[PDB]
Each structure stands twice: as structure tokens, then as C-alpha cells.
Amino acid sequence: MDVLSKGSLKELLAHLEKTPLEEAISYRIGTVPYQNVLISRNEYYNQLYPDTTSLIDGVSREGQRNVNGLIMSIISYVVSGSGHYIPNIGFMLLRRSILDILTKHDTGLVTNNLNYGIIARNLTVSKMNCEQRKRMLICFKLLAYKDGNQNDYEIYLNQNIPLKQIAPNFIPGDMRTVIHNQDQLAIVGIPLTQSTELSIRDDNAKSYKLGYVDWYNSNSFLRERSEFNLIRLKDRDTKYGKLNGW
Amino acid sequence: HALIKEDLGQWPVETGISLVNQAGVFAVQLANKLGIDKPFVLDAGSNYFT
Amino acid sequence: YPDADGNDVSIIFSGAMSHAIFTYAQSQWNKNIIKLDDYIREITLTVPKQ
Amino acid sequence: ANRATSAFLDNPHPVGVNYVDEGSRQFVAVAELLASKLIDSSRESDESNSDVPFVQAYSKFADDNPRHLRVKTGGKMANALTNVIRSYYSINAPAIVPQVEIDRLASKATVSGDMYNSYAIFNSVPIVEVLSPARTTVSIVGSDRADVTMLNTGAGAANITFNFGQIAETVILKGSVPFQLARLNQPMPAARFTYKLRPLDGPFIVVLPVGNPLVISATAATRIQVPLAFNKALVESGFQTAMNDGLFDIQNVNYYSSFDEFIISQYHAQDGINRVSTCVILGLALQAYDQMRRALPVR
Amino acid sequence: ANRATSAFLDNPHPVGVNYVDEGSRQFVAVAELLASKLIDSSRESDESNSDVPFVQAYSKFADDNPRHLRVKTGGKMANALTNVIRSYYSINAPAIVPQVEIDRLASKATVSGDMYNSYAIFNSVPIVEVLSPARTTVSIVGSDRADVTMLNTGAGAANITFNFGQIAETVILKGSVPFQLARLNQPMPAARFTYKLRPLDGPFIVVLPVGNPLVISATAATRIQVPLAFNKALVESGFQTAMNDGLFDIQNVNYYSSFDEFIISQYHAQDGINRVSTCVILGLALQAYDQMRRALPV
Amino acid sequence: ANRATSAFLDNPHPVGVNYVDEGSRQFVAVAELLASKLIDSSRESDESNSDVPFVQAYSKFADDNPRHLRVKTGGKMANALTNVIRSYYSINAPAIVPQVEIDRLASKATVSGDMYNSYAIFNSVPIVEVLSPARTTVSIVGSDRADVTMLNTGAGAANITFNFGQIAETVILKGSVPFQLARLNQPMPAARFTYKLRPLDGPFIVVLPVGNPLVISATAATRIQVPLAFNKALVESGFQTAMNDGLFDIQNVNYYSSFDEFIISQYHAQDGINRVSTCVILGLALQAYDQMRRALPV
Predict the structure, then answer these.
(1) Interior CA angle at A198 toward A193 and A203, to 5°?
(2) Which of C6, D225, F150, F277 is most buried (CB neighbours < 10 A)?
(3) Which regions of D59-145 does DSSP assign to beta strands (E)?
């Protein structure tokens, strides 16, 4: 809910630096990602409404234990607000922040073999709005410059002309580009009636939209009560035990 | 010998007249005596000694 | 002694009906004590959308 | 030997694994409480010929003041409840309700989400296995009251083995004519009309004579922990409404006549002790579903 | 070829046409509401240690105060409710209660006689016909759970046709042994224990192998629109009470075991929609009757 | 001649003879009233955020205050209620509860009623005997809905005698195929599907043709005087709980599936008029046991 309200590249990057990977992942099994299902939308139809599940719905789904699974969960969190279920990630990765997973080499994750075309297909980029595509391209560009695969990012953009039109105009190394960026990446925001939408993505997105006004006021006190005497998880000092399976 | 008694007063009742009617009238009096007829919050966290 | 929510629980020797009547009245009034944020939400539902 | 089993105990489909945490149990409990208030407000509205009691209850339920041009279906809470009911029934049902919605709807009232306050008695009789020799014929018919018809054709009396499982608490057997029943490796008592058995005690052998068919009627009672708001009359009515509306039309699932059979069939699975908890939650949701549709009718 | 049918579905008798209008519907709603207060007045009397709550409840229901030398009967409303129930069951029953008396009793409490603001589930399984070929025996037993016993003494497998009507919403079939069932002009699937089917789909063919008998248990669910004050448990008890008291004792009518069978049998008549509305109003009247007579036995 | 009887009608065991006086009857009514307030209070406490209604309800019921560490046994009222239920079932039960303790518990509340104020309808069908000739075979299965399957393999039509006793009010007979039934030494009518009979009319003869078997389904209704607070749904569930908790495990006793079967079996016996009085008291005790246990599981 907080990641969706960020409307600037500066605010989105600042949030990712503060947020650990734990809130990008989820601990709920969910269902299989791609599946033709019939859902009940009684506000419109007596019959069951056909739809296809995906990873863009704000609902947890099963993900494999690999770098592709971790990347998909991070992007889904940015573009949808809810991550995926990757089993037993490990303490060392969960304590790192999202941006360091995307842009730093000390995390212990190899991302040199990522295929951008396959990730977009798996994330169903076709059923994404303008804001979501921009956020996905921000994550792709950060990974591309981290591993030196800047050429592959350009090849992917050239193959997808519509994405090339709305691509972000920032260079990850430079800071002048981030300061002067003028993109609008906000998905949720204060304005809508308490009604139901037909699609799973549209219904879940509207649920975030209607709950943002209430979340703006109620989160302050309830949060502060939780970590009144709690040590911050992000970059927590430890004995640096091990990283298993990566 | 010793004992503990709860003193809530003496409220006589007439046999011929309706008991629910008398109980309702006595209920208004009892609520006023206990001070619970009007909205209130108990503030009894300060009366202690260490 | 303090409770989980921050309230103060007083344990005293008292009568049975005095405890029952007083504590029941507390529950009834507390049913209508709500947070300000919840009150604002109730108000907003009874006014036009603007 | 021949094997006979009750139809409703054959291959119970897996149940949902989502919406079973404490937050989701609170959401179902909140829905059931608010659905009940809706039906009481509907009676008060009819009696007083005013929409004030209904508007107040619908606003508390749907968080949206009713409008003439639109259609009243329960709002977002109804959408979440209906789709959550589907998820409990089968694993193949999708999980589409986000958890920001569940937490938001769980806060509309204060209720204890514990589902183990009280108990309930379910009457479905489980006959897992009836074993008969080659000369005999055995037929099992019924769910609430199982009727077992046995006919012996061979020369001598036959022994029939009854297996009632290990979950049912008590089982009462009645015969059209007096019959002989005993345990494994136990003397046969004199012929009686009715027997009371403990299914945990062991397999039971029935001596079947060669003369005339013997019909044994079985009735069982089992105890399953349920919340204090559980009401069997409402849950059963909610079950049929869900089946009629098509909420249970998922691929590769089994269909049951009543909620009695559904919960008992799921209990007798390999991991039934964990499946019953989900079914109880589905039962409370169905009771909330029943009260909600009866208050808001759609033809 | 033989055909078999459910016993309770045979020859539904015509129902009454009086006491269906708005004023009469509100009389039944008032009678149900006031009779309910009569039962609850007993619990109030226990708590209040006095008979005043009961006296108030009976005075409103009967327009007369209770007496100790008289057996409490209910007065005009009890007489009106009893006679109105008789008219509902048969068209041969007289309509004795005047309209003016109905309007006066309908003004006692504020209600709306809307009988279409809710629904109920009725569990009577309708088997209109079962068509079987020669050398095949078919027996239909039961009304709430219908058991069909099928025996094939012939040389080969037989095809038996089921017709569940066009009214029931769902029917679930559970067999003693796995069997094959399919719609007309459809291929047969693998043998399964349970089938869920919509009667509107069409006649169903079940394959009967030669050997031991096959028994199929049928459970059906039907949705009928009823008033919000409807309670199936009270209606069912009222049906048995009225039958015992002889309110249904009239020439040239049929007798049913339960109200579930009565309403479904009438719904499957030549024009069953005309009789469903009257049957539901009879249900509310019976629910009022059960409460009134249990509080005031006679 | 062959004789076939219902299973549940065979050998009703003697019912206990203690705790049936006016004072003991008052105790059961008070226990039922206090238990109902307990379960209603428990629901309100769960609905609300505070536990006041349950604390008062349990204090009145158990004569002590609830504790978070000790278990909620229900007090001496729960102990007395459990033991009297044991005594009511069989005459061989101990019945060692002092009468002074019963009177003390009966003074907690006062009840404005008795055990004969109202009535209830019981649906078990009594089939005392079915008499058949040498060649025919008759099987009776069922208690809520009796199903009598008769098959004729002789030369010609046979006559089957039905005895429904003299206690039941009305019995409804339905058949798989139309059949003829008439009273003893009376002409037979044309074949019909459903018959309505008064068991006191006399033994009934049924014409059984040679050929396919005939199955007759019987439903009966009996009226028994009960207190106004009687509820069959609560009594039936209380009956199952008592059996599961082992309150009925006594030597030389009979076991029944439902309380409806138990009360009809006792009524259809010599001195059955005196037995139903104790069975009704036991039924109301089971109502209190159900409500008390569902609020305080152990």
C-alpha cells in the first residue's frame, strides 16, 4: 500500500532502500499462477465470470526457489503491492533491502543470466497499465546496469516498441537523472464508489484504492506500537551464517 | 465469630402490587445511588499506596 | 496491575451484586465509546461524496 | 470376498488451504454477525413500513448507502464472502481475495474468532468396509440412516464383517429380525433386536442365516468442535443455496447431499483431523451466506 | 416396457382461491406475529413470577381477557385462522370468514403481507417417470430421499430413463455400486458413485448391468419464494397438528405426509405456478396455528 | 402365519421411579430455565468484548464464580442434573442424589407452568404386528418412515394384516404401486396410492397380488403432553450427547436411536400411560443438559 502511493522515481527508490526483502516476499501458499478459473461477480451477472489468474493480482502465488523467482516476487510487489511465496529464502537475504538485491553485488545473488523477455511474459506485461510497465522497466534497468547487461536492455526495448515509448529516462549510475525525472508512477492515491470490478486485477487494485484513505490515518499509531522496543531488521548485524541454495 | 455482609439497603415490596413495577422503580433509585445512570468511565488507577 | 491494552485492573474484596451491577453498566457504556477515527468514518457515510 | 462401502465416503476431494489463519477466521465471524443483523433489520423494516432499520444495517454491511438506480447485492463484503466460500471447498478453486480486504473487513466488529468454543453432533453413519463371502450379497443404501440388506444363498451360515471406522463415537444397529453380532474372537450372544457399539472397539462379525434376508439399520453420532454461533439449520440451508447458485462447480470435485456427509467424508480421509477445521470455517461462512441472500433477494 | 412414478406426485387436488388478497395476507401475517408473542409470554411469566404478561398477550390475540372458568380458545382470531386454513387446502371447502372480520383482525398489528421477499429450500425429490424395458424391475420408495431399486434379469445390459421434471434445481444421485449415467444422445462416462445433475437438462439414461440389484438414492433441492417470517420447523409441526385436528378432512382430496410433499406435488401440476402462491400462504397460516394451539391446547 | 414387528417396539425396559414428584419436577424446570440463560449469555459475551453476562449466568447456575484456572464444571446443579438423567432412564440406576439437595436447587428460580401445559408431535410409526400367510415374506425397516416390503410367491392373492396399535392419532400409508386396503371384515375399495387411517379404527387388511413386490411407506403422528418450554430439536441433540457421555450405560437396558423412538416405545407398553410422564421429565432434563454442555464443554 505504501509502495503503490509513490509517484516519483525519487520516492520509489527511497522506499526500496528502506524496505527489506521480507515485505516483498509472502508466507501464504496461494494457488497456481496461470489458470483459467470461474469467479463470482454477483453485482453484474448471475453466471460465474471467467478470468485467468496471474502474478499481477495482489494475491500470493507459488514461486520457485531461484533468482528468477525472487526477481518476479520483487517486481510483483512494486507493480501490485503483494509478493509471492518463495519457500525458505533465508535470513541473510530477507534482511537486505530491495534496492540492494537489485543494484548491489554484496547480496550473494547472481543475476547475469536473467532473460528480460521471459520475465515480462511470466509477469503478463500485456495486461499492465502505463504506470506498472514503467515500474517494471525501472527494475529491469537497475538489474541491467548492475550486471553490465545494458545492451540486452536495449535489445529488449527495441523488440517491444510500445515499451520503448514509455521507457524511463534515468541512468542508474547518475544522480542528476533521478533528481530531474518527471515520471508519474503512482497507482494508489487519494481521489470512487464502494463497488466491485469484473477483473481480478481491477477488483484487487480498487481495494487498495479504497483502503488508502483509511490507511493514511490509521497506520501511524498502530505501527509505532509494534516496533516500540524492536530492533530494525534491515541490514541487521549477525554472524553471517550461510546462504544456502543460491 | 466473624462474617462479611453486603449492605445494599432494604427495599420493601407489597404483595398485591406488581413486582416488576416495583423493581423498575427501585432500579432507577439503585442506579442513582451507585452513580451509573449517566455515561461514565471508571478512574480508579490512582487510589493505591506503595 | 496493568492489562495488555494498558487499562488498570483493580482486584478488591467487594460484594456480588455490587460487582455484577457496576461491571455490567461499564460494559454498556463502553459499547458506545469509539475511537475518533471510527467516528469520522461513520460521519462520512452520512454526507455527500464531496 | 466381496467389498461394500458407503458412497459418500469414496474419494473425498482436497479442501482449501487458504483463508484459515486468525485474521480470516475473524472475517468469517464478522460476516456471520453482520449478516444476522441484516435479517433482523429486514423484519423490522417490514413491520414498521420504514427503510430506516434496513439502511442502517446495509450501511454497516456494505459500507455504502443504498441507491435506487443500482442493485443491492451486499457490496464488497458479499463479493469477498462468496469467493472465499469457493476456496474452502476445493484446492482447485482460485484464491482471488486480497488480504488488505480481509483485514479491513475483519475490523467492522469485535468478535472472538475461535472456532472451538462448543461442539455439534453430526448424524452421518460411516460404513468403511463390509466384507462378505462368495455366496452372500450385500447392499448399502443411505447416508443419515444406512440400510444394509444381506441375503445368504450358500448352504451354511455366513460371517459378515462390519467396519465403522475409528472416528464415530457411537453406532446403534437395529435388525428387522433378531440377529447375532459379536467382536473379533468373542462368543456370540443370543439374538437381539438392537445393539449399541463403539466403532473404536474393533471389527464386528454378524452371523447371517440362510433362510430370509436380513436388513440392518445403522445410526451414528459424532462430535465435532464448532463455534458458539454454529447453527445446523442455517448451515444446511446455506449449503443447498451454494450448490444451486453454482459456487461448487469446480473441476474434479465430489458432490454431497448435505453438509452432514461432507464433513464426515472429509473426516475419514488420511489427514481428516486437519481437514475438519477448514470445513467448520466453511460451515460458518455458509451460515453467513444463507442469512445474507435471504435478506437481499435476487431472482 | 413399464413406467414408475413417485407416489406423492399423483393427482394433486385443486387448492382454494379465497383469502389470497392483500387484506387476507396481512391477516395471516398478523396472526403469526401475535401467536409468536403468545409463546414468548410464557417465558416472561416465569421471569416475572406473574401471569400478567400472558394476560396482555392473550387479550390482544382474542380481544377478551382470559377467564379461569373458561378454557382459553383464542376467540375470533382463533376461529378465523382455523376456518381460513380449511379453505386453503381444497376448493370444496367453504369460505365462511367474512371480509369485514378479516380487515378488523388485520388492523391489530402493522405488517406487510409480502410473500415474495425471501426463499426456502424444499427437499422433496420429484420422479415424474422412470421408463424401463422388459425383464427389468424398478421400485421407487421414499419422498425426501427416494431409493430406486433396479434389477436386470435379462441377458444383456438395459437402458433405463429418468425424468425428474422441469422444476427442481439440482438432483444428486448416489448409487450402491458405481454406475453409468448420461444425458440423451451423449456418451457414457466411467462408473462413478455420485452424479450431480440439473433436471432441466433432459431425460437421463442409466446403464443397468445384469447381476445384483442396483439401488440409486436421489436427493433434490428446490427454491420457492416465501415470506421472511417463514420457518420450516414450525410449518411442518403445524401441518401435522392440522391433519390430526381434522382441518384437512374433506371429500375428494389427497393426503400428504409432510408440507414438503404437498407444495412440491402442487408445483408439478398442470399449472403448478398458480398453486404455489396459495400453498405458501397456507404455510404461514399453519405456522401461526402451531404456535397458537401449543400455547392454548383444546 | 408369520409375525413381523418394528425393532424399536420390542421389550421397553422399565423406567426409573424416583425424582418424579412436584419438587423434583420443579428442579428440572429451573435447570432448563437457568441453562437457557447460560447459553444466551455465552453468545452475548462472545459477540461483545466483555464477559459480564456469562459471569452472572454461571454464578447463578453453579453457585460459584468462574475462574480462569479451574475448569467450569457447572457446579452442583450440573452434578445433580447428570445423576437424575441416569436415574430416569432405567430402574437399575443408583439414584443416590439427596432430595434436600434437589429442593435447594429448585428454589433458585420459580416457574409459571407445569409438565402438562402443552403438547408435542412425535413422528415414529408404531407397527405392533404384521401378519402374513405361509408363502409371503414381509420385512419392516425404519422408524421415522417405516418401509414394509412384501412379496407374494404363492398361487393367488394373499391378505396381510396391519396392526398400528391404538395410541397413534393418524397414520399415512403410501405405496410404490397402487394397492387396496380396508378394515377387517369390510369390502375392499379400488386401488389407490395413499391412504389416511386412524389406528383405533382397527386392524387393516392389504391385498397383495402375485408378481412384483409391493413396498408400503408409513408415516405416523402422535401427540404427547409436554411443558411449554419443550423443544424437540434441543431434546434430540441432548439425547445424543447423553448417550455419547455414557449416561445410559446400565445393565439390562435397551438402546434407541432417537428420543422420539424411546418415548413411543415406552408408550406402547403395559402401564405406558404412567411411563410417558417420566419420559417427558427426562426429555426436559436432556434439554437442559444440551444447553449446559454446549456452553460449558469438558
Answers:
(1) 60
(2) F150
(3) 118-122, 129-132, 136-141
- D193: nearest CB among F7, F142, F237: F7
Three-state SS for D73?
Answer: coil
Provide the CB-side half-sphere exposure for F114 (13 A, CA).
7
Nearest to F121 among E4, E237, E254 (CB): E237
Residue E76: enclosing H or E segment and its boundaries? helix E75-89
Distance separating alpha carbons of residues A5 and D284, to the nearest angstrom? 36
Q: Is the dihedral of CA B19, B22, B24, B29 positive or negative?
A: negative
Backbone angles phi, psi at F76, to 5 degrees: -75, -25
Instruction: Specify the amino acid at residue A118.
Output: I
Listed residue (F38, C38, F43) closest to D111, CA to CA: F43
DSSP-assigned states of every residue in D216-265: EEEEEEEEEEE-TT--HHHHHHHHHHHHHHTTT--TT----SSHHHHHHH
Minimum Cα–Cα distance from A213: chain C residue: C41
Torsion angle, alpha carbons of C17, C19, C20, C26, to 10: 140
Breaks (C-N over 2.5 A) in chain B follow: none
Subunits adjacent to chain C (3 or more Cβ pairs under 8 Å): A, B, D, F
Name residue, grid cell 434439554.
F287
Residue E163, classed as helix, strand or coil, is: strand
Answer whether C4 touches D (CB < 8 Å): no
Q: Which of D49, D233, D244 lies at the smallest CB-CB distance from E110?
A: D49
What's the CA gap between D100 and A1, in Å, rounded?
9
Find chain C residues with C-beta within 8 A of F49's C-beta: 27, 30-31
Distance from CA of C5 to the nearest CA of F (A): 13
Q: In one letter, which amino acid is B21?
A: N
Residue D149 bridge partners (DSSP): D139, D215
- D133 within 8 A of D154, measured Cβ to Cβ: yes
> What chains are in contact with E, requiring at least 3 Cβ pairs below 8 Å?
B, D, F
3-state SS assignment for residue E67? coil
Beta-bridged to residue E182, according to DSSP, are E205
| Torsional class of D67: left (φ above 0), alpha (ψ -120 to 50), beta (otherwise) | beta
Cell of D215: 436388513
Chains C and E touch (3+ CB pairs under 8 A): no
Show Cβ contacts of residue E252 under 8 Å, excluding neighbours closer than 6 positions: E13, E90, E92
- How would you write chain F as a 3-class SS string? CEEECCHHHCCCCCCCCCCCCHHHHHHHHHHHHHHHHHHHHHHHHHHCCCCHHHHHHHHHHHCCCCCCCCCCCCHHHHHHHHHHHHHHHCCCCCCCCCHHHHHHHHCCCCCCCCCCCEEEEECCCCCCEEEECCCCEEEEECCCCEEEEEECCCCCCEEEEEECCCCCCEEEEEEEEEEEEEECCCCCCCCEEEEEECHHHCCEEEEECCCCCEEEEEEEEEEEEECCCCCHHHHHHHHHHHHHCCCCCCCCCCCCCCHHHHHHHHHCCCCHHHHHHHHHHHHHHHHHHHHHHHHCCC
- Residue B37 grid coordinates: 445512570
- Cβ partners under 8 Å of residue F116, min gap 6: F225, F227
Residue E222: strand, helix, or coil: strand
Q: Do C31 and F48 touch (CB under 8 A)?
A: yes
Question: What do you get for the CA distance between the two ends of chain A, in Å?
Answer: 30
Structural contact between residues E275 and E267, judged by C-beta atoms closer than 8 angstroms: yes
Beta bridge partners, E2, equal E132
In sequence order, what are the beta bridge partners of E162? Answer: E130, E204
Give the span between the Cα atoms of F54 and F38, in whole angstroms.
7
Task: Report the distance separating Cα C38 and Cα C49, nearest Å.
Answer: 17
The method recorded for this entry reads cryo-EM
